[PDB]
Structures are given as C-alpha cells and as structure tokens.
C-alpha cells in the first residue's frame, strides 16, 4: 500500500512502497548489465543521467497533489498545536489516498519507462564465454553500491532503536491509563489521545521495516559469497543477478522507510514533551 511521512514539522511526503521497490530492482539491473563487461562501464554516466531523468519526473507527478497535501499539513498543525477534528483528519487522509489512486496511470508509466530501460540493458548483457560467464559486475556493483549500506546497518543497533521506543510508548500509556481517572478535561486530552495512537501506528511500520532490514542483511551477506569469485553459464548468471537485484531492492526501500519513519516518530514525540510542558505547569500549582 502507501506510507505517509512527517520527518520535520511542517513537512509531509508519502511513499508508494510497491513503486519505490519496482524502481530500485530496475536500477540494479541497469548497473549489473553495465558493470559486467569492461567496455560497457563508461555507459554509467548516461544510466546515472537516466535514473535522475526518471526520479525527477515521478516527483513532479507526486508534487501535482501539493494542494490536497498543503490542506493536510493545515489539518495536522491544527491538531498538534491546539470528534470534529478527529473526523476532519480521516476525510483529508482519505482524500490524499484518492489523489495517488487518481495519478495511477501517470505513475505506472514512469514505472514502465524505467522497466523498459533496465531490461533493455539486461537484454544487451553479452557473455564472452556464455559457458563460462564472469562475475566482476556482481562484485564491483555490490562492493560499490550495496556494501556501504550493509556496514551502515551493521553499525546502528536497530533493536535498541525499538527497545528505546517501547520504553517511551509505555510511560505515555501509563500516563493516559491513570489520567483517564476523573482528570479527562483541558490538558488537550485528545492531542495525547491522537499522537499516542499516531505514534503506535508509526512504531508498527518501524518494527515491520526493521524486521525486513535485519532479514535481508543476512540473505544478501550469505548470497554474495555464492556469486563472486566465479564463472556461471549465462542461464544461471542471468537469474543470479535478478535474485540479488530482487533482494537488494527490498533491503533498500524497507531501509529508506526505517530512517524516515524514525525521524517522523521523534518529531511526533517533540509535540508530546511540549504538550507535557502544560501538564507540569498545570499540576505545579495544586500544592499551593
């Protein structure tokens, strides 16, 4: 489906998951089809050029729903800095999903234009010995496009990242469990009822993506060894690159979202401690 993202306050930008992944798979077929032979190598600049020429145009197609989007930030900023508004949210949210569903034929064409490019380069991939096909392009590409990312994930503890997040998600829940007592009034009780619900849905997407990230970081690390200092027959080589491309694309899309969804969660926890400034200053007077 789709994924809504509030990285900074006053910033909103969506990601159609099957789309981002479809694009990435064809980017890896483009590079591996180029990096195979030593001669093709120089093509990279034109491929580099093309990816930009296709990405920029997708961003234009998505930026054509800016108004419906800018109407959403308005309905979002209103609930963050305070049924009527609760139902104002769902109608505007359901309006944005329709805008993407409207530009469906618009999106699927940029999608096919890149599939028509990437496969064209893949069809063009020749072998000198189809019996004994080289795997330099696999090693070069991985070591230059995918490896940094494996290190990048192996460095940051994505588990503590969730561990720290439930600890936060817990106290706010402990706060709302005993605030509901006979206190339910003016502490913008609905804002704490909205963000906690909003933050809980964010964590579920993070926990969903981190599993996929931790998943594919094993799969990719295991699968390279099998296809690196050797020479397959074309029939296998053709397949072997696609599998690595299929597995790269997931890792990458699902990773991109884990960083976006991380940032989106803390800008949604900025508006909790700020709306907690109220609750402390409130309760500080009662002892007088």
């Amino acid at each position: 489906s789709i994924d809504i993202l509030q990285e900074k306050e006053g910033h909103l930008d969506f990601v159609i998951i099957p789309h981002y992944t479809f694009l990435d798979y064809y980017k890896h077929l483009s590079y591996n089809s180029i990096y195979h032979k030593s001669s093709t190598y120089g093509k990279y600049i034109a491929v580099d050029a093309f990816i930009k020429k296709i990405n920029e145009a997708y961003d234009k197609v998505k930026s054509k729903c800016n108004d419906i989007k800018n109407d959403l930030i308005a309905t979002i900023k209103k609930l963050e800095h305070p049924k009527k508004m609760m139902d104002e949210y769902n109608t505007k949210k359901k309006k944005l999903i329709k805008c993407i569903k409207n530009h469906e034929n618009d999106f699927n064409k940029i999608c096919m234009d890149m599939k028509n490019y990437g496969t064209n380069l893949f069809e063009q991939l020749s072998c000198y010995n189809n019996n004994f096909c080289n795997t330099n392009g696999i090693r070069y590409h991985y070591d230059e496009y995918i490896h940094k990312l494996i290190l990048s994930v192996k460095s940051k503890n994505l588990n503590k990242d969730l561990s720290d997040m439930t600890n936060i998600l817990q106290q706010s829940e402990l706060l709302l469990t005993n605030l509901n007592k006979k206190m339910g009034s003016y502490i913008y009780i609905d804002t704490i009822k909205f963000i906690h619900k909003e933050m809980k849905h964010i964590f579920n997407r993070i926990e969903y993506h981190t599993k996929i990230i931790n998943d594919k970081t094993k799969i990719i690390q295991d699968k390279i060894k099998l296809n690196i200092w050797r020479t397959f027959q074309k029939d296998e080589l053709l397949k072997r690159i696609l599998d690595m491309s299929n597995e790269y694309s997931l890792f990458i899309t699902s990773d991109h979202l884990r960083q976006m969804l991380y940032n989106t969660f803390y800008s949604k926890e900025k508006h909790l401690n700020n709306i907690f400034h109220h609750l402390i200053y409130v309760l500080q007077m009662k002892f007088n």
């Epitope: 030593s38 001669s39 020749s126 000198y128 010995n129 189809n130 080289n134």
Partner: antibody, heavy 120, light 112 residues
Framework: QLVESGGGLVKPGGSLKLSCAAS????????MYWVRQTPEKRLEWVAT????????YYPDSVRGRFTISRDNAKNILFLQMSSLKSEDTAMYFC???????????????WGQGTSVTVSS | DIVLTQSPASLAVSLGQRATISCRAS??????????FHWYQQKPGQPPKLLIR???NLESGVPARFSGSGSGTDFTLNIHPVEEEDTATYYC?????????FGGGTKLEIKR
C-alpha cells in the same frame, strides 16, 4: 585491420616480443587472440586477453612461458615470449574475437602473420 | 582437452561436383540454445579467413555454394558446385572450453 611485428631468429632459450597494430575498429571493445601456424600448417591457439585486460587464458603448451598484454591507449597487442623451445617455430597471427551477443564468437579478423624461428 | 577430427585430410573433386568435409569432436560443443563451432578457409599463403560463424552462420562475402551444418559432436561442411576459387586448406574450430582446439586440416583439390 591488424598488423604483426617483432618476429625473427632467436636461439633456443632466448626471448622475443611480438606486437600487433589494430585499426579500423574500437580496440577496447574486443577480446584478443594469438594463434601460431607451424610449418606443417597445424593451427595451435596461443593466448586470449579480455577487452580491459582483466581476463587472460593460455594453453598448457605455453603456460608461464608466454605473456599476453594490451595497451588500449596505443591500440596494440603484445605477446611476450620467454625461454623458447624450437617447438614454438611458427607463423604467429594476432586475431580479433567476433564479439557476438549470444555466444563465444569466432576469430573474424586475422592479421597477416609474423614468423618466429627458434634455431641455434 | 577437446579434439576435433577432420575427415578427409585431402580431397580430390571434379569441377562442379560435391565436396564434403566432416569434423568430429570429443565433447559436445552444443547447448539447446548455441553451438560454439566454426569453419575457416585458408587459400595458399594467406591467413585463415572466416567461412562459417557458428553451425551454418555464413559470412558476409561467402557464396551460395558453401553450407556448414551439424550440432553436438558431429559437423559437415558442404561445397556444391565446386569452382577454381575453392582450392584451400579447411580447418574446423571450437570456442566451447578453455583449450581452444583447431582441426587437422582438409586440403581441397580440383580433379582435372
């Protein structure tokens, strides 16, 4: 077209460098070969070099005795000959691989040849 | 190491008749998709010139009379009608394995 130079008379145990001047085409797109033709007309494959020098193949007959190299900048093919036997006496041809999409193409263009002769 | 056996070694042929050269390989040089084999022509005092590309993949400049055939281990180069511009040593080659092997040779000969 291709042109072989560097042949002549070497005593057994000696060394010799053979060059090939590639023209009419984009040298660094093609895999390159060396083929000898003995006086009794037998064709014996000598060496294969990839477009960007990364892959090199030699028959067990010439293993570690001969060295194939290219200078894609100067558009030249080189066969180093070291510690030669009389057995190497032959017409040394340099040749372009076909560069077929589906397959392991033939020796499409063949140079004129250079005579090597290993006799004391 | 693959070995390519050409039958015959020499061949006597009257002008206009049929000429048949057969190459036999130790290992199969084919795949249900490709056939890494090739025929050349070697006119006296000249380098071998590429005659047939794969099985029958004739060359841009090779007449209608020439026709190479086969798959796997057994191949056949057919020349009909034979003319004077045909007297040459014929060599079959393989591009299948690491040891790229050539054939023995087949000297065509016009019977007068």
């Amino acid at each position: 077209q291709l042109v072989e130079s560097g042949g002549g008379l070497v005593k057994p145990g000696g060394s010799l460098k053979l060059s090939c001047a590639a023209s009419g085409f984009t040298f660094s797109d093609f895999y390159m070969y060396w083929v000898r033709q003995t006086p009794e007309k037998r064709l014996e494959w000598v060496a294969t070099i990839s477009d960007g020098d990364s892959y090199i193949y030699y028959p067990d007959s010439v293993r570690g005795r001969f060295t194939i190299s290219r200078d894609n900048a100067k558009n030249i093919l080189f066969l180093q000959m070291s510690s030669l036997k009389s057995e190497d006496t032959a017409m040394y041809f340099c040749a372009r691989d076909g560069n077929g999409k589906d397959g392991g193409d033939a020796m499409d263009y063949w140079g004129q040849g250079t005579s090597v002769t290993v006799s004391s | 190491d693959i070995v390519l056996t050409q039958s015959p070694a020499s061949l006597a042929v009257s002008l206009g008749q049929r000429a048949t050269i057969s190459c036999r390989a130790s290992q199969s040089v084919s795949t249900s998709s490709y056939t890494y084999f090739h025929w050349y022509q070697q006119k006296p005092g000249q380098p071998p010139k590429l005659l047939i590309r794969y099985a029958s993949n004739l060359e841009s400049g090779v007449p209608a009379r020439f026709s190479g055939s086969g798959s796997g281990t057994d191949f056949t180069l057919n020349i009909h009608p034979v003319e004077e511009e045909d007297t040459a040593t014929y060599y079959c080659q393989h591009s299948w394995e690491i040891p790229y092997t050539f054939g023995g040779g087949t000297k065509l000969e016009i019977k007068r």
